[PDB]
Amino acid sequence: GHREEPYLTEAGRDAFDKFCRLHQGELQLLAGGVLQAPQPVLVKECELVKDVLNVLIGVVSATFSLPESISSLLSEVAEYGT
């Protein structure tokens, strides 16, 4: 064997990162280079959730003082605590 070589539809934690990096770079070219969002993920999942848990206390955190589509996800979950 060698395998039937898994598609982009199947594999989703390494090809997912590859696609995320690629569409991020494509959008940055389509604007020109004045957008600039590195890292398809980062910091982690749990760290950002604990950050948002501290946002609901109504005080400072590590990303506020109180893909790249994470900010659209992050705004409604921070605006609960604001």
């Binding site: 604990k50 501290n54 206390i57 005080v59 400072v60 955190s61 590590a62």
Partner: protein, 100 residues
């Protein structure tokens, strides 16, 4: 603790002159007033560079000392020892999640 020694004596003289049915009112000794050792509120490192799951234990132990007036380890008791209150200073390099 030192500044109060004046006000006490002027107030005592006011009541000593007034008393005509007696003389000689008593006082408590000077070390009741002067010493910051009879009250509850009388080497180090930056706490921020420590790992997080040791920082929580260290800061909690320090704070429990701090509440009862005893000076901390990574919380320094700022200088006073006159009137009422006192202030304490935790390090501003402590991790944000703990610090808030």
């Amino acid at each position: 603790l030192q500044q109060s020694l004046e006000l006490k004596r002027k107030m005592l003289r006011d009541k000593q002159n007034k008393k005509n049915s007696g003389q000689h009112l008593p006082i408590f000794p000077a070390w009741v007033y002067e010493r910051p050792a009879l009250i509850g509120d009388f080497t180090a490192l930056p706490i921020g560079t420590l790992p997080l799951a040791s920082q929580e234990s260290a800061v909690v132990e320090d704070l429990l000392y701090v509440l009862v007036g005893v000076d901390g380890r990574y919380v320094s008791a700022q200088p006073l020892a006159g009137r009422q209150s006192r202030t304490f200073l935790v390090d501003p390099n402590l991790d944000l999640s703990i610090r808030e």
